């Protein structure tokens, strides 16, 4: 239809104008604003340079080609314009990966140190990204996989020339970065929820009265057992979640060992009546095993964390693991499954890590925990506290920039997911699938991808307070005369 042709031209005109003005504002703002002048934003400047390239030479030729309803320029213009569109779109996905790693390394640095993370080698990594993308786009000139597509009025990467090239492009320059970025932002989100989650004004040693040795002697006395190395579990009783069954099997393995006499176990929780029986059975057979099926208050749990020597976390699946942080507040050394969430909290100096679902490896860990002398235990406890303390320090920070960068990525993925999905579909049978795929779907997936080249300036102005203020600062400074 006549309107379908002129509609596409509007989209490109809009994309071009917004891209040039908007990305000039992004590059200006970063070098103008002191807060935006960080080296971690070098990745944002190269991304704006990548976005700008397509609007000066390739996109205006595509716009002219709509009106000509054909390629009226040379084969060389068809090759160079197709090439620079490659450099831009491949450069931008890798630059987005660069930001995703930079930000994940920034949160980790602020957790371990009081000094601000300085992305010192950031400019050196941007030079590797453009060497990586130039290495990926350049083989296409000799392969002859760049040609004109009448359906979208442009010269681009033809997905039907050779399926091997298109499969590799979809795998290495879309799926691989996707997995890396999804991993970076997932690990960031969990660490923010842990920062949010902890309460240092509740889980605080100040509320505990005497000495640790005293508190423990008193706790054990109430339970009717002598002084020993005491271990505690606090969780639901279930087959494949919190792993009280791995702990129960471990207590059985240790009951034949001489070293068991020196051990004390406080198992707290409820759930499977079978796992309740097994636990009550070990309680009757051994006077160093105590089970608490009742529900205890935060206050009493806080006293237990400040008395017991170790907290066992034998979980199969533990997304956040606030329990470990809560225990570390009151100097309880955790022995926990090296699963997600707990591996982020427990460092090698602040606890013992074990492979989930192995009663043998847990039994040996408990034996290793027993062999630790008072002196080693004091440093371990001190470390545990310095680790909990580093989580709560990040509480007043502004986590808005993480959201803006995440939105910049999410929108990139939406714009390019159809193109890459079609890419795969065409790769399966280029001869058969070129007609079998709808024309509206094809034209939409290409112009959606083109539209992405103007989105980042709009996002920065809508979610980042600094970019919003600076955009206005520049606009006025150029349009308000001096007299």
Ligand X SMILES: COc1ccc2[nH]c(-c3ccccc3)c(CCNC(C)=O)c2c1
At closest approach, how far in Å is the CB of 305 from ligand X? 53
Q: Phi and psi (nearest 5°) for 267? A: -100, 115
By beta carbon distance, the residue nearest ligand X is 86
State both tokens at 297.
Answer: 């208050």
At closest approach, how far in Å is the CB of 139 from ligand X? 8
Do residues 62 and 149 touch, judged by C-beta distance below 8 A? no
Contacts of 136 by beta carbon, 8 Å cutoff, 6+ apart = 86, 90, 169, 172, 173
Do residues 288 and 303 touch, judged by C-beta distance below 8 A? no
Spatial distance between the Cα atoms of 40 and 102, rounded to a whole number of angstroms? 7
At closest approach, how far in Å is the CB of 85 from ligand X? 4
Binding positions are 140, 159
Judged by phi (left if over 0) then psi (alpha if -120 to 50, else beta), residue 341 lies in left
Between residues 84 and 111, which has the closer beta carbon with respect to ligand X?
84
Stretch that binds ligand X, among 82-90, 213-221, 246-254, 454-462 (CB under 6 A): 82-90
Among 12, 63, 370, 419, binds ligand X (CB under 6 A): 419
Complete edge-to-edge strand list for the sheet that includes strand 289-292: 289-292, 263-268, 229-234, 310-313, 333-337, 352-354
86 belongs to the binding site for ligand X (CB under 6 A): yes
85 belongs to the binding site for ligand X (CB under 6 A): yes
Between residues 156 and 350, which has the closer beta carbon with respect to ligand X?
156
Spatial distance between the Cα atoms of 478 and 324, rounded to a whole number of angstroms? 55
Strands (E), 294-407: 310-313, 333-337, 352-354
Judged by phi (left if over 0) then psi (alpha if -120 to 50, else beta), residue 271 lies in left
Between residues 152 and 195, which has the closer beta carbon with respect to ligand X?
152
Between residues 155 and 312, which has the closer beta carbon with respect to ligand X?
155
Question: x/- string (CB under 6 A) for ligand X, residues 40-79?
Answer: ----------------------------------------
Between residues 132 and 208, which has the closer beta carbon with respect to ligand X?
132
Positions in 259-288 near ligand X (CB under 6 A) = none
Distances (CA, A) of 447 to 15, 28, 59: 10, 28, 11
Question: x/- string (CB under 6 A) for ligand X, residues 450-469?
Answer: x-------------------
At closest approach, how far in Å is the CB of 152 from ligand X? 9
Number of C-beta neighbours around residue 80 at 10 A: 18
Query: Among 372, 328, 375, which residue's Cα sits nearest to residue 229?
Result: 372
At residue 16, the 3 state secondary structure works out as: helix
In sequence order, the β-bridge partners of residue 78 are none
Number of residues counted as binding ligand X (CB under 6 A): 18
Among 129, 137, 188, 268, binds ligand X (CB under 6 A): 137
Do residues 92 and 177 touch, judged by C-beta distance below 8 A? no
How many Å is the Cα radius of gyration of the chain?
30
Query: Among 363, 361, 366, 359, which residue's Cα sits nearest to residue 246?
Result: 359
Q: What percent of the residues of the chain are helix, what percent strand, and what percent coil, each to the nearest 5?
A: 70, 10, 25
In sequence order, the β-bridge partners of residue 118 are none
Between residues 377 and 425, which has the closer beta carbon with respect to ligand X?
425
Among 331, 423, 457, 461, binds ligand X (CB under 6 A): 423
Among 48, 82, 220, 246, binds ligand X (CB under 6 A): 82
Among 156, 392, 404, 456, binds ligand X (CB under 6 A): 156
Among 16, 52, 89, 454, binds ligand X (CB under 6 A): 89
Strands (E), 57-151: 146-149
Between residues 93 and 308, which has the closer beta carbon with respect to ligand X?
93
Among 157, 233, 265, 391, binds ligand X (CB under 6 A): 157
At closest approach, how far in Å is the CB of 278 from ligand X? 56
Among 29, 65, 420, 456, binds ligand X (CB under 6 A): 420
Between residues 65 and 140, which has the closer beta carbon with respect to ligand X?
140
Between residues 119 and 145, which has the closer beta carbon with respect to ligand X?
145
159 belongs to the binding site for ligand X (CB under 6 A): yes
Query: Among 207, 203, 181, which residue's Cα sits nearest to residue 194?
Result: 203
170 belongs to the binding site for ligand X (CB under 6 A): yes
Between residues 86 and 334, which has the closer beta carbon with respect to ligand X?
86
At closest approach, how far in Å is the CB of 170 from ligand X? 5
At closest approach, how far in Å is the CB of 145 from ligand X? 7
Among 278, 446, 467, 471, binds ligand X (CB under 6 A): 446
Contacts of 178 by beta carbon, 8 Å cutoff, 6+ apart = 413
Strands 333-337 and 310-313: parallel
Stretch that binds ligand X, among 112-120, 180-188, 375-383, 442-450 (CB under 6 A): 442-450
Binding positions for melatonin are 140, 159
At residue 156, the 3 state secondary structure works out as: strand
At residue 334, the 3 state secondary structure works out as: strand
8 belongs to the binding site for ligand X (CB under 6 A): no
Question: What is the binding site for ligand X (CB under 6 A)?
Answer: 82, 85-86, 89, 137, 140, 156-157, 159, 166, 169-170, 419-420, 423, 446, 449-450
């Amino acid at each position: 239809p006549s309107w379908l042709a002129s509609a596409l031209a509007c989209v490109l005109i809009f994309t071009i104008v917004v891209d040039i003005l908007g990305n000039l504002l992004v590059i200006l703002s970063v070098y103008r604003n002191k807060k935006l002048r960080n080296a971690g934003n070098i990745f944002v400047v190269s991304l704006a340079v990548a976005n700008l390239v397509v609007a000066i030479y390739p996109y205006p030729l595509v716009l002219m080609s709509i009106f000509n309803n054909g390629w009226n320029f040379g084969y060389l213009h068809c090759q160079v314009s197709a090439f620079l569109m490659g450099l831009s779109v491949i450069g931008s996905i890798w630059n987005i990966t660069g930001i995703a790693i930079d930000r994940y390394l920034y949160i980790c640095h602020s957790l371990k140190y009081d000094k601000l993370y300085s992305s010192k080698n950031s400019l050196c990594y941007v030079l590797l990204i453009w060497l990586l993308t130039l290495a990926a786009v350049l083989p296409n000139l000799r392969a002859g996989t760049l040609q004109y597509d009448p359906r979208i009025y442009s010269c681009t990467f033809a997905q039907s020339v050779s399926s091997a090239y298109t499969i590799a492009v979809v795998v290495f320059h879309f799926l691989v970065p996707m997995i890396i970025v999804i991993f970076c932002y997932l690990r960031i989100w969990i660490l923010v929820l842990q920062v949010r989650g902890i309460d240092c004004s509740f889980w605080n040693e100040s509320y505990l009265t005497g000495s640790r040795d005293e508190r423990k002697k008193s706790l054990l006395s109430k339970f009717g057992m002598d002084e020993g190395v005491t271990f505690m579990f606090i969780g639901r009783f279930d087959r494949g979640q919190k792993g009280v069954d791995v702990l129960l099997k471990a207590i059985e393995i240790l009951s034949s060992k001489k070293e068991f006499q020196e051990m004390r176990f406080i198992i707290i929780g409820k759930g499977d009546p079978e796992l309740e029986g097994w636990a009550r059975s070990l309680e009757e057979k051994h006077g160093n095993v105590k089970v608490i099926t009742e529900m205890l208050s935060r206050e009493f749990v806080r006293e237990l964390y400040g008395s017991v020597d170790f907290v066992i976390i034998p979980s199969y699946f533990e997304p956040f693991g606030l329990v470990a942080l809560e225990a570390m507040c009151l100097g309880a050394i955790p022995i926990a499954s090296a699963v997600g969430g707990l591996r982020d909290i427990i460092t090698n100096e602040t606890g013992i890590l074990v492979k989930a679902g192995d009663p043998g490896e847990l039994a040996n860990a408990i034996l290793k925990a027993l062999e630790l002398s008072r002196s080693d235990l004091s440093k371990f406890r001190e470390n545990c506290k310095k680790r909990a303390m580093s989580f709560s320090k990040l509480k007043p920070q502004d986590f808005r920039n993480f959201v803006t960068m995440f939105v910049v990525f999410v929108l990139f993925a939406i714009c390019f997911a159809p193109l890459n999905f079609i890419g795969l579909a065409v790769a399966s049978d280029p001869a058969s699938m070129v007609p079998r795929i709808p024309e509206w779907l094809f034209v939409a997936s290409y112009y959606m991808a083109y539209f992405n080249s103007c989105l980042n300036p709009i996002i920065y102005g809508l979610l980042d307070q600094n970019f919003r203020k600076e955009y206005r600062r520049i606009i006025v400074s150029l349009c308000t005369a001096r007299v």
